[PDB]
Design a binder for this molecule. Sequence first.
Ligand SMILES: NC(=O)c1ccc[n+]([C@@H]2O[C@H](COP(=O)([O-])OP(=O)([O-])OC[C@H]3O[C@@H](n4cnc5c(N)[nH+]cnc54)[C@H](O)[C@@H]3O)[C@@H](O)[C@H]2O)c1
Ligand SMILES: NC(=O)c1ccc[n+]([C@@H]2O[C@H](COP(=O)([O-])OP(=O)([O-])OC[C@H]3O[C@@H](n4cnc5c(N)[nH+]cnc54)[C@H](O)[C@@H]3O)[C@@H](O)[C@H]2O)c1
Ligand SMILES: OCc1c(F)c(F)c(F)c(F)c1F
Ligand SMILES: OCc1c(F)c(F)c(F)c(F)c1F
Ligand SMILES: [Zn+2]
Ligand SMILES: [Zn+2]
Ligand SMILES: [Zn+2]
Ligand SMILES: [Zn+2]
Lengths: 374, 374
Amino acid sequence: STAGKVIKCKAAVLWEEKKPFSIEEVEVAPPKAHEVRIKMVATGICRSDDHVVSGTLVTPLPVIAGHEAAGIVESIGEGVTTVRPGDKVIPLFTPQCGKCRVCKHPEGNFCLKNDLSMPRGTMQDGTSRFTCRGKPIHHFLGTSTFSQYTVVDEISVAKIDAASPLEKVCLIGCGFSTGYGSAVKVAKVTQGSTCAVFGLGGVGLSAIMGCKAAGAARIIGVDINKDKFAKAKEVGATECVNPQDYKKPIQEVLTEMSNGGVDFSFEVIGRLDTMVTALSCCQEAYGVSVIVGVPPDSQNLSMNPMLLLSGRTWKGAIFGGFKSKDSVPKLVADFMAKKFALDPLITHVLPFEKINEGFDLLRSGESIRTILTF
Amino acid sequence: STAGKVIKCKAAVLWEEKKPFSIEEVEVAPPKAHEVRIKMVATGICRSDDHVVSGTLVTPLPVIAGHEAAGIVESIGEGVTTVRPGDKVIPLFTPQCGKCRVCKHPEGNFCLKNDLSMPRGTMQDGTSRFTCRGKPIHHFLGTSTFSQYTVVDEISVAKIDAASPLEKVCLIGCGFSTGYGSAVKVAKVTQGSTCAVFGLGGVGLSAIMGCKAAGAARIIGVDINKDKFAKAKEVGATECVNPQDYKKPIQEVLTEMSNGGVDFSFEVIGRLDTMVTALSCCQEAYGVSVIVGVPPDSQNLSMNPMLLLSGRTWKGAIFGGFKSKDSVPKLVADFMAKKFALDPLITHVLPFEKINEGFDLLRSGESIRTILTF
Ligand SMILES: NC(=O)c1ccc[n+]([C@@H]2O[C@H](COP(=O)([O-])OP(=O)([O-])OC[C@H]3O[C@@H](n4cnc5c(N)[nH+]cnc54)[C@H](O)[C@@H]3O)[C@@H](O)[C@H]2O)c1
Ligand SMILES: NC(=O)c1ccc[n+]([C@@H]2O[C@H](COP(=O)([O-])OP(=O)([O-])OC[C@H]3O[C@@H](n4cnc5c(N)[nH+]cnc54)[C@H](O)[C@@H]3O)[C@@H](O)[C@H]2O)c1
Ligand SMILES: OCc1c(F)c(F)c(F)c(F)c1F
Ligand SMILES: OCc1c(F)c(F)c(F)c(F)c1F
Ligand SMILES: [Zn+2]
Ligand SMILES: [Zn+2]
Ligand SMILES: [Zn+2]
Ligand SMILES: [Zn+2]
């Protein structure tokens, strides 16, 4: 048995920014009280993982990244009550402690135990379960899914359906649930409305899916890579526009196309300029814009508050506004019942050992989601 | 009889920025089709009128300002159906045409016929009804209430209760309805919540009134002028804070006071810095901040969009989000039914001839609302 013992396994360690991951042996400590050690089965490559490499997102290095994944519980620490060895689980990069003011609020999901706002790169107890070359290695968002085995706090894992296909439902751990929730829960897109989605990667595709599910009459996809347009239309976009095709700023184009501004817009890229453009393109009196993209570290946007004074609503969200631990199992159940599709997001499959090729695919513009198999 | 004739009357003309109003004779043309000429009874001095004087707001000069008022219909043009000679009325600085996409939208009030966004300083037909010393004088927001008589478009006037005391209900034309609606309708303050109101003038006080009416448990007033605090507590503030008393930024103070951020905040001043502070002080996952204040023309703020990504909502509104022509008569009816009070807002009552003295009372920090009586 491996229970109570250190596990030696392979992980993808990031030693330095702007460098390939190093696939090499790490030591994974056994779970402490209220901790869960998970044998990973599949993990997706999300742009936020790439932000760690690029320094768009600052988190302590060296690190084991990865936050969109699914696996099987190997062992549980003392006091764990919500999962058992052998359960299928999704790590929760946004925890749900159930006890803080946000967890208790009907509309909050950004649990105060998160490691996103001011990342420490640790477990909840401020220590690391990972050693590599005798050196401690940081965690990422409490999940660190780029490893054959990880350890997570109990508040950062959800039990899911035992019959779930883990190579698909890993996307519920980030990109799908984020985009879909951003539309259905955060924006509360309405029947017959006009939507604009900026960025047609896995998360923006998922936002399109949610807009369509909510009954939007028009869904305008916006991307500078026209190769993204065919799949955006397959999942519900009614039209697609490339800002590079136009002499005028795209907020003006979108305001014209929507006869005075869109009902709902979504920034699903991570640029300061598109955040302001996306706000501006929604109708000035009653439009809603949602920021989903992750901006470059420590940078401020500039905007005219008259955009808001007229009536616009501007909001953002992590993980589609979903209370993570309550929502993930339900989302998996709904997937199993064919209430939404995940295959449109999966463009490439690779073994974990080819993680760097997976990142190359994302950076080239070729992929949506590459799913890595352990 | 004056109907169908030019009226020569007294008005307060603003010939140039940063100068006193000139109280002198103007000529007021009769109303054209779908226009209403009103004998003014009382008008309030709103900070937004002062913004015209100071250059904070840009609108064509020379102008007859004034937008918070009440009077009695003198005559109607052909085709008017919603008011008759002798009716008590409130001019609507945000029109309600009833036909545009905003007017048709359940949550929109910033009617596309407004003269706020891109001011022309005319009637709807692009002409002026005012002359002074042989020169055409601009209108302001379709209202121009600093005159013994004005002419407004029908879509910019509401009939109110014939028994209304005009010297009080004129506040429903701007400051009361703006503050109150910002709380009750735009923010949708909840029972038991904690609110922070930045700026304790007439509009901020009315926002306090709304927060209290909505059942807030804590209402923190914020102002640099501690002389404003006693009246803020009278109308519902549970605590008041002066940023100048603290070594730390007031967003930090308010976050500490509210054990991690407020539920609802309101910027009711008109400064870029306080708009950002107000957003920051609301709880990062589920807080809502509403911009009410009018900032200096053409200036952008800077902010970190992580404030929004965590879950905050940022919005603004004109006129408390109220559909103007539907709402004004109901607000007056509610006042007559003792559902809210207006007297706490009124600190001074002066003849119209003392308009400049009224503006000096506002600028010196000594008044809340001065009501000018014709
Ligand atoms: N809020 C959350 O909880 C959350 C979750 C998941 C992802 N993210 C972020 O969301 C963003 C999208 O993630 P993803 O879908 O995995 O990334 P992605 O697959 O890189 O998709 C982004 C898309 O944006 C397009 N794009 C780039 N620049 C522009 C431009 N100027 N105008 C229009 N399109 C442009 C680009 O071509 C690509 O198709 C990233 O910033 C992520 O970090 C946030
Ligand atoms: N959105 C709308 O429809 C609408 C309607 C009415 C008024 N307004 C605007 O709302 C604002 C308030 O109007 P008002 O109540 O008539 O003005 P006011 O009576 O001048 O009140 C403003 C208050 O802000 C206080 N103040 C000034 N600087 C600061 C600071 N740095 N920190 C905290 N407090 C400060 C000041 O002492 C005063 O009590 C103005 O900008 C108006 O133009 C907007
Ligand atoms: O993709 C999800 C995701 C985010 F939305 C973040 F804001 C973040 F900081 C991060 F590390 C992350 F992985
Ligand atoms: O006080 C109400 C009011 C506003 F909210 C404005 F945005 C504005 F431009 C204006 F002239 C005005 F009077
Ligand atoms: Zn929590
Ligand atoms: Zn992600
Ligand atoms: Zn209208
Ligand atoms: Zn006003």
